[PDB]
Amino acid sequence: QEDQQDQLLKKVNTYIKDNHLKAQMTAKRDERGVVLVLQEAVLFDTGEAKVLKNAETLLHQIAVLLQTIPNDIQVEGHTDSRNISTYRYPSNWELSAARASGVIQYFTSKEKLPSKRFIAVGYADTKPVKDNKTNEHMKENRRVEIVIKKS
Template identity: 55%
Template structure:
């Protein structure tokens, strides 16, 4: 009896087809991933580009992003290294004689103002190596143990601010007190009081004439630099003062500050 060898036929796709399908799926996923990474949010990209465009440092570099307003329509300097005019440049280029003339004129005008307004007993103006020095007694600016500028002081400080607006000199404002101790909630010691008084004068000058705050330096010396021994009422009054030093640029900064 002949036995017929029966071959068993496998059902479904051949085995190589499974491997091929997996490979094609992976390739499809790979290209989908590349496509998703290549799509840029135009709105976000424009916001980033605009932020770079607003930076002065990038004004002279061509942008890789086309804008509705081309570069030639914007106010861009032809020379990328050209800077805006420095208000202090002309002052720096002045020679020593011209600087001295400016300071002498300022001193003369302040002294004239003090004489006309009969303020010479409360305020003095002089010139030394540091520059023009204005010494304002406490009663010309503040009430006792206070750092708020009184109304009567505003005209003179306004005059000083007007003069300072015409020159770029640095200004050091010193607060000084007498040796009598103070211990209040606002001013625990003479250090706080003297510093607050110097700061009040600077704040008034800046606000009154819109002066550059970088020109000023406030220092509170407390009672460490008396001009007279703290042994009498008159001497105590002399020590309670605010000093404005309108500095001479030729003087060493280490000595001024």
């Protein structure tokens, strides 16, 4: 399990390098597995959960990586603490869940990855990187995390 995880992270970071994606995503290991972190700006508009047209190439490049491994995928949405209460997103829970769902719907309906591999998770603002006391800290909180679970 320990060597497996270090080999997967190495494989993932190598994919990021070979495809010139360092500015679009970062990879790390924690207790969940190997996690891809994508800041909001490479996927969505502010307060929205529709995958941007220019984001589809990036999600395609990630899908090509995900097709080479068997692991289950957990896609997590995270917001900063700024209030959202629109018709489309009545709270940060719905917005964070809608963003994870939107990514998975892309993976399954356009990239044809099996639905049974995915779980959509919304955290609202409960897992800040640090806090929400500055605009810099709020910005890093607005993110999607693609968790490659241990297999």
